[PDB]
Write a protein that binds this ligand. Structure first.
Ligand SMILES: *[C@@H]1O[C@H](CO)[C@@H](O[C@@H]2O[C@H](CO)[C@@H](O[C@@H]3O[C@H](CO)[C@@H](O)[C@H](O)[C@@H]3O)[C@H](O)[C@H]2NC(C)=O)[C@H](O)[C@H]1NC(C)=O
Lengths: 49, 43
């Protein structure tokens, strides 16, 4: 899920990676703006019976 | 006019990226034993 961020990217830096080597913030190639990357919601499903 | 030449060395380095993403402080792991502990402890 994308979202506008507030991470100052340096002119040569385009992708911001996470601890697990996953990109958690990107700069759009067309409009030089910083976006926020967040995985879509997930979770276990438990059936109560 | 004065110009220095600090020849670079291939050496592991503990960069402390600040809240803003700019390296503020650092530790040279091979400088001395105390620095080496900091790198191993990652602190
Ligand atoms: C990374 O950038 C942020 C935002 O500037 C820094 O956050 C801290 O935010 C407060 C409130 O903005 C700063 O107080 C002051 O803010 C006014 C503007 O609101 C500014 O004109 C003052 O000079 C003063 O900065 C606070 O100072 C600021 N932190 C620092 C160290 O200035 C955040 O600190 C920045 N990270 C680093 C490591 O500098």
């Amino acid at each position: 899920v994308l979202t506008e961020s507030n991470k100052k990217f340096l002119p040569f830096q385009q992708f911001g990676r996470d601890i697990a080597d996953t990109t958690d913030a990107v700069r759009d190639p067309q409009t030089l703006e910083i976006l926020d990357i967040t995985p879509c919601s997930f979770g276990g499903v438990s059936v109560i019976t | 006019a004065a110009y220095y030449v600090g020849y670079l060395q291939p050496r592991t380095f503990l960069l402390k990226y600040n809240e803003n993403g700019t390296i503020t402080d650092a530790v040279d792991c091979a400088l001395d034993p105390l620095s080496e502990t900091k790198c191993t402890l990652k602190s």
